[PDB]
Design a binder for this molecule. Structure first.
Ligand code: NA
Length: 100
């Protein structure tokens, strides 16, 4: 499985194009704020939303703590999707600069 740190993810903002981020937390959690540009698809619904993922692209998956997102990454890869886990989750990403 592939993974990157939150520090690495933030520095990605300084790159040419924005990366694809998928926030798999639940509704009330995302209600507290999300990373600008992130798509919200709860983990439980990932199996029914495979059509969202473009096979030619890569998706960075984030959750509250980093474990559940890793589970989603493995699931996605085993279904032909390119995914990377964001280590530490939103806990480590922090509550600064989020979209409310
Ligand atoms: Na959504």
């Amino acid at each position: 499985m592939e993974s990157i740190t939150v520090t690495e993810l933030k520095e990605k903002i300084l790159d040419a194009n924005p990366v694809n981020i998928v926030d798999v937390r639940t509704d009330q959690e995302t209600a507290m704020g999300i990373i600008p540009g992130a798509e919200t698809i709860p983990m439980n619904s990932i199996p029914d939303n495979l059509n969202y993922f473009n096979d030619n692209e890569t998706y960075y998956i984030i959750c509250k703590a980093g474990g559940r997102s890793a589970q989603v990454v493995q699931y996605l890869e085993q279904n032909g999707v390119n995914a990377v886990n964001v280590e530490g989750g939103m806990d480590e990403f922090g509550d600064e600069g989020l979209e409310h």
